[PDB]
Nucleic acid binder design. Structure first.
Ligand SMILES: NC[C@@H]1O[C@H](O[C@H]2[C@@H](O)[C@H](O[C@@H]3[C@@H](O)[C@H](N)C[C@H](N)[C@H]3O[C@H]3O[C@H](CO)[C@@H](O)[C@H](O)[C@H]3N)O[C@@H]2CO)[C@H](N)[C@@H](O)[C@@H]1O
Ligand SMILES: [K+]
Ligand SMILES: [Mg+2]
Ligand SMILES: [Mg+2]
Ligand SMILES: [Mg+2]
Ligand SMILES: [Mg+2]
Ligand SMILES: [Mg+2]
Ligand SMILES: [Mg+2]
Ligand SMILES: [Mg+2]
Lengths: 200, 88, 49, 129, 143
RNA sequence: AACUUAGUAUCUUU
RNA sequence: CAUGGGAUAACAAAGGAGCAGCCUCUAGGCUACCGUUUCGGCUUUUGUUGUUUUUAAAGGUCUAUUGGAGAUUAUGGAGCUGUUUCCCACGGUGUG
RNA sequence: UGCUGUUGCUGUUAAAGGGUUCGUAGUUGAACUGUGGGCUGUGCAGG
C-alpha cells in the first residue's frame, strides 16, 4: 500500500476518507524535511479525522483523533505539528485530541472503588479540554449557578497567551460541546495568582 | 398584589409595611429611627423639574452607622451618583 | 505446599509476559521490514516516473 | 475538628443573612452543599452563587437577597417517613404556609413538598425559611 | 507538631500551586529525574531531603508534576524505600536520644513529659501503619 | 454599576 | 418475609511494582484424561451385552502464521566508538 | 413539671467543668468517581 498510509491505523488504510488521506499525506511529508517533527513522527499514527462546522464563523475545525499512548509524543511537538497541519489545510483549525475511554459510573460502591480515576468523565473531559488549548493551561475554573437553575463552567487562561488563543476560543468551545456535550466559557486572567480577571 | 390574600381574592392584611431599600427588611411601626429621604430629579438644565426619588432606610442600619454606605450604594444603583471621576 | 503453588503461578506469569514481549518485537520488526518494502517500491515508482 | 461541612455552610449563610450582608463566602464546599443551595435558589431564597475550584475542597460565593430569615442543618440526619412530614413542619417550621424542610431521598435532594408529591421518604438534611 | 500534643495553633505550611504543569524552562527529562531520585536515595538521603535538594538546586518544584509519581513511589518501585516509614523513623530517633539524655539526667521531668508525648505519638503512628500494612504485624516500639 | 495594579526614612558602625 | 428506589450513610476489602492477564485467522508437530501409600476409573455410533483395539475431538506444551487493538513513543531508552497559516487594517502572532 | 430536658434543662457569680496531660473501649469524623444531549411546541425566562 501507499507509504503515507502508515500514518493511519491499519483499520482505515484500506479505504481512508478524504480528510484522513489528506492528514496522512501531510504527516508523511512532515516525517521528512522537518527538523523537530522528524524525531517523533515515525512512531506516530492517527485514528480518524473529523470536521466540525463551528457556526457563526468561517474556518471549520479539523479534529484529529490519535491513540492515547502517543500523548507524550504529541505534547512535545503539538505547537509545531498544529501549525504545519494548518498550513497544509487552508481555511481550517487543527485540533489534536487523544482518544480516551470513559468508564460509566457504577451503582455499586465496591465497583466504584475499583474505577480507574483517569477513566472518569470529569477527568476525561478536563484532559480533552487540555488537549484543545494545550499551549495555554487552565489557570482557574469556576461554575456560575444562575437563579434559573443552570450551571455554567468558566475556564480562565493566562492573559499572556491571549494573542495566540483568543481567535480559536470560539472554535474550542463549540468543538468541546461536540465531543463532551458540556458547555465551557472562556476568560482571561492577567494575574492568575491574585485572581485578577482581564477587563480588556 | 402584595400581602396576604383570601381564597375569595380579598386582601386581609391590615397594612403593608415599607421595606428597606438596602436590606429588604420590613420597617416596623415602632422603629422611629427609620428615615425616608427624597432626592430631587434634575432636568437638562440644573433646575429640578417636578419629581423626586424616595429612599427608605431601616433604623437599625442608621444605628450601626452603615446608612451612609447604603445610600451611596443605592444612589449609584439608581444612577444618581457617579461611581468614579471621568477619564482625564 | 502453598509455597510451591504460589511460586509456580509466579513462574508461569513471568514466562507469559516474556513470550508476549517476544511476539510484539516480532510483529514490530515484520511491519518495519514491510514498511521498508513499501518505501523501496515507492523509490522504484519514482525511477519509472 | 469540622464534622459536618453542610452544617458549617448553612450556619455561615444564616449568620451572614442575620448580619444583613449581600455576599457570603463558604468553605469548604461539597456536592450536598451545592444541592442544598440549588433547592434554596429554586425557591428564591438566595440569588446567584459561584463555585470556585482550588483543586481541593472548593469554595462558594453566594449572593444574598433579603428574603432568607434562617437556615440550619439537622443533626443527626433523622430519617423521615412520608407520614412524618407534618410532624417536622410543626416542629421546626415557623408556619404551614411557607418554609421548607430539605431531605435527602433516593430520588435526590429535595424539599419536603416535592418529596410528598413524589411519595418518598428520606433523611432530613436541614431547613430554611 | 502543631495541634496534637501541645495546643499549638501554628499555620505555617506549603501552598501548592493551582497550575501543575512543569515550567517551560525545565528541560530535564522525567527519566533523569527518576535517576537523580534513586541516586540521592543510595547516598542515604530520606525522601524529604531528596525533594528539598531537587527543589533547591535543580529547579524541580514538584517531582510528581514532572514524572507523575511521588518520590516515595519511585523509591518503592526501585527497591530503595526505607524499611521503616520516614516519620516513624524520626520519631523513634528522637525518643531514643531523649532516653539517652534521661539516663544521666534523672530529674529532667520536662523531658520525661515530652518523652511521654513522643512515645504516645509513636504508638498511634505505628497503629496506623500496621493497619495499612506498611509495618509487619507484631512490630512494637520498645522503650 | 462595584476599577487593570495607585508612599517612606533615622542613629551607630574595627 | 417479598420486592422497587440509591441520595445520604454503614460493613468488608485494598495501601496501589504489595502489579494479573491483548485478542484473532489458519496450518501443523508432540501429548490421551483423571486416580495414585493404593493399579483403579474413564463419552458417542458401530443390532445388543461383555472383551480387545483403532480413526479420532477436546483440552495442554511447542513451531509457527494471518489480521486487528493496546490507558502511555521499542524507528525508543541505557551501556559502546568515531566526526505559509491565522487575526486585524498593511501590520501583528504561530510554525518553518 | 422545659423540676430528668431524644424532642427540651442547667453548670462565671444561684446547685453544678474534673488541678494538668497522656489514653483504651465508646461516640464522632474533610473533599472527590455525578447526573446527558438533540428536535418541536410553549411560558413577562433572561441578558
Ligand atoms: N518480640 C518478639 C515477639 O514475640 C511474640 O511472641 C510473644 C507473644 O506471642 C507472647 O507475648 C505475650 C503477648 O502476646 C501479650 N500481648 C502480652 C504478654 N505480656 C506477652 O507475654 C510475654 O511477656 C511477659 C512479660 O512481658 C512474659 O512474662 C511472658 O512470659 C511472655 N510470654 O509470648 C511471646 C513472648 O516470648 C511473637 N513471636 C512476635 O510478636 C515477636 O516475635
Ligand atoms: K478511644
Ligand atoms: Mg492537643
Ligand atoms: Mg505480585
Ligand atoms: Mg416532666
Ligand atoms: Mg409539659
Ligand atoms: Mg432547672
Ligand atoms: Mg456555685
Ligand atoms: Mg464525608
Amino acid at each position: 500500500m501507499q507509504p503515507h498510509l502508515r500514518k493511519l491505523r491499519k483499520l482505515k488504510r484500506g479505504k481512508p476518507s478524504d480528510l484522513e488521506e489528506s492528514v496522512a499525506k501531510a504527516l508523511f511529508e512532515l516525517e521528512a524535511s522537518h527538523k523537530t517533527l522528524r524525531q517523533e513522527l515515525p512512531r506516530f499514527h492517527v485514528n480518524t479525522v473529523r470536521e466540525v462546522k463551528v457556526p457563526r464563523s468561517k474556518k471549520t475545525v479539523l479534529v484529529v483523533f490519535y491513540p492515547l499512548r502517543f500523548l507524550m509524543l504529541v505534547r512535545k511537538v503539538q505547537r509545531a505539528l498544529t501549525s504545519e497541519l494548518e498550513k497544509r489545510h487552508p481555511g481550517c483549525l487543527v485540533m489534536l485530541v487523544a482518544q480516551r475511554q470513559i468508564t460509566k459510573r457504577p451503582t455499586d460502591v465496591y465497583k466504584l472503588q475499583k474505577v480507574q480515576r483517569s477513566k472518569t468523565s470529569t477527568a476525561v473531559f478536563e484532559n480533552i479540554l487540555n488537549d484543545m488549548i494545550y499551549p495555554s493551561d487552565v489557570v482557574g475554573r469556576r461554575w456560575r449557578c444562575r437563579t434559573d437553575g443552570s450551571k455554567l463552567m468558566k475556564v480562565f487562561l493566562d492573559a499572556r497567551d491571549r494573542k495566540r488563543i483568543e481567535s480559536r476560543l470560539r472554535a474550542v468551545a463549540y468543538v468541546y460541546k461536540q465531543l463532551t456535550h458540556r458547555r465551557v466559557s472562556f476568560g482571561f486572567m492577567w494575574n492568575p495568582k491574585l485572581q485578577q480577571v482581564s477587563t480588556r | 398584589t402584595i400581602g396576604m390574600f383570601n381564597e375569595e381574592g380579598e386582601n386581609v392584611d391590615l397594612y403593608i409595611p415599607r421595606k428597606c431599600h438596602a436590606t429588604t427588611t420590613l420597617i416596623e411601626a415602632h422603629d422611629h429611627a427609620a428615615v425616608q429621604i427624597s432626592i430631587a430629579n434634575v432636568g437638562p438644565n440644573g433646575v429640578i423639574n417636578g419629581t423626586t426619588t424616595t429612599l427608605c432606610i431601616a433604623g437599625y442600619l442608621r444605628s450601626q452607622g452603615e446608612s451612609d454606605h447604603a445610600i451611596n450604594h443605592i444612589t449609584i444603583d439608581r444612577g444618581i451618583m457617579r461611581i468614579k471621576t471621568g477619564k482625564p | 505446599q502453598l509455597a510451591e503453588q504460589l511460586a509456580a503461578k509466579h513462574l508461569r506469569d513471568e514466562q507469559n509476559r516474556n513470550k508476549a514481549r517476544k511476539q510484539e518485537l516480532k510483529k514490530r520488526e515484520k511491519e518495519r521490514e514491510r514498511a521498508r518494502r513499501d518505501d523501496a517500491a515507492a523509490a522504484a515508482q519514482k525511477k519509472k516516473a | 475538628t469540622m464534622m459536618s461541612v453542610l452544617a458549617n455552610a448553612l450556619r455561615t449563610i444564616a449568620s451572614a443573612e442575620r448580619r444583613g450582608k449581600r455576599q457570603v463566602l463558604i468553605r469548604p464546599s461539597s456536592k450536598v452543599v451545592v444541592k442544598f443551595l440549588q433547592v434554596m435558589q429554586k425557591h428564591g431564597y438566595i440569588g446567584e452563587f459561584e463555585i470556585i475550584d482550588d483543586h481541593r475542597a472548593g469554595k462558594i460565593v453566594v449572593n444574598l437577597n433579603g428574603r432568607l430569615n434562617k437556615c440550619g442543618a439537622i443533626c443527626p440526619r433523622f430519617d423521615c417517613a412520608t407520614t412524618d412530614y407534618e410532624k417536622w413542619m410543626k416542629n421546626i417550621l415557623p408556619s404551614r404556609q411557607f418554609g421548607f424542610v430539605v431531605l435527602t431521598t433516593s430520588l435526590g435532594i429535595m424539599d419536603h413538598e416535592e418529596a410528598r408529591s413524589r411519595n418518598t421518604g428520606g433523611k432530613v438534611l436541614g431547613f430554611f425559611y | 507538631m502543631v495541634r496534637m500534643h501541645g495546643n499549638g495553633r501554628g499555620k505555617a505550611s506549603s501552598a501548592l500551586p493551582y497550575r501543575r504543569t512543569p515550567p517551560a524552562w525545565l528541560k530535564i527529562a522525567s527519566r533523569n529525574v527518576v535517576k537523580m531520585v534513586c541516586k540521592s536515595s543510595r547516598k542515604g538521603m530520606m525522601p524529604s531531603q531528596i525533594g528539598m535538594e531537587l527543589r533547591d538546586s535543580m529547579g524541580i518544584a514538584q517531582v510528581k508534576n514532572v514524572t507523575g509519581r511521588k518520590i516515595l513511589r519511585i523509591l518503592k518501585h526501585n527497591g530503595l524505600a526505607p524499611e521503616i516509614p520516614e516519620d516513624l523513623y524520626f520519631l523513634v530517633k528522637r525518643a531514643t536520644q531523649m532516653r539517652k539524655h534521661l539516663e544521666r539526667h534523672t530529674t529532667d521531668r520536662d523531658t520525661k513529659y515530652r518523652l511521654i508525648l513522643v512515645e504516645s505519638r509513636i504508638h498511634r503512628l505505628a497503629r496506623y501503619y500496621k493497619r495499612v500494612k506498611q509495618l509487619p504485624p507484631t512490630w512494637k516500639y520498645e522503650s
